[PDB]
Symmetry: C7
Subunit: 73 residues, 7 copies
């Protein structure tokens, strides 16, 4: 869609890359999000330095910690 | 959960064990008892972990949302 | 049914542990708090790593620095 | 009042207080006024860093956003 | 007139985004909101002048943004 | 007035003040204006350091969010 | 000056060179073109400096007010 949050909806049910502050990263399937960018991923993995360090299954990430969001696979 | 209501995932986790990761990496594991829209929450039979291990048994604890990075129903 | 701030009401006049950002900790009796979690402890003690480093008497702690509150 | 922590401050108006700040600086002085954000004014204030007085400020306005806690100060020994 | 209008005139232009902590992105500005959240197309994340990652479309939260620049040519 | 600390600022208009910021940066100058966020303007501002000017700035607008304290002196 | 409108000091600086000091040793210099109540502002012919030396030529740039410590006037070339 148009504005950033409206567009983010196009990613629902798709794999995404969530880059967090502190140079942490999560990958998983986007299932929900609000206008604060709080969001839920399914089948999520936390990566660090490039390696998967934890399997977080379903996870709710607080938007305040997010740096950027991009398409994964 | 509703595509526009991410906090419903907390509702779906009431009474289930959860993992809470905070800024600065402190982590807490406990049974989720309640929460609010700021993601403040109350856990029972809670434990605090540091560097991959349990460092403190807290019992019931209210955790302020503003310091939370994520909440996981884990595996 | 009790959201956090409401649940906190049950600790009123009872001893609590307050952990702050930067690892400082306070112990005392919860006398009051508001919605921002600003709160007052009576007979408060400031602990660092293990023992008391300061006896405060009645202290008002700003909620913004709080990481967690427990019994 | 269990819903009014700021009443604690009210009881301290015109008495010596200790204001502990983020970064661990500390101010001591007489509380003259404060608002709901905990911005406040002290008269006869001293600024302490690493244990000692580093400055005498006279009257000072401290922004609440930097405060960690406030307690009562002691009278001279 | 207002800063937000300059963003509006940058739609479809290449931009340089510098974040707090110094992460940098360069890409084509596609959209933005009043909080300065932005979407860039054909983005590259850079560290010290070298592309660290090719992102394709990316949504950058405005709260971490230090500046958004239209840069210089060549 | 025990409910309006900002009045202490009101009382310092057109008088020299010392401004202490997060990070320990210090400024001195004549207070000319301020708002409820404590954003303020100083004329003849000088950045100071351990009681020693290190930069003469002229008129300056300081963002309130970085202020630790303001004293009349 | 309007004792209650400190942002007017910016109004007076529109189309003039300014110095934008950020959260530690970093500053930008450029000609102020616009600003809002959050202190977000736009500069033209701008530069980013570190340690007093030009690090990057920023052209027209929007700087977010949340990172600004202070704003003062810049100078014309010697």
């Amino acid at each position: 869609v148009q504005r950033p949050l409206d567009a983010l909806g196009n990613s629902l049910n798709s794999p995404v890359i969530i880059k967090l502050k502190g140079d942490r990263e999560f990958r998983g399937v986007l299932k929900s999000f609000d206008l604060h960018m709080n969001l839920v991923l399914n089948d999520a993995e936390e990566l660090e330095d490039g390696e998967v360090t934890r399997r977080l299954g379903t996870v709710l990430i607080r938007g305040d910690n997010i740096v950027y969001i991009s398409r994964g696979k």
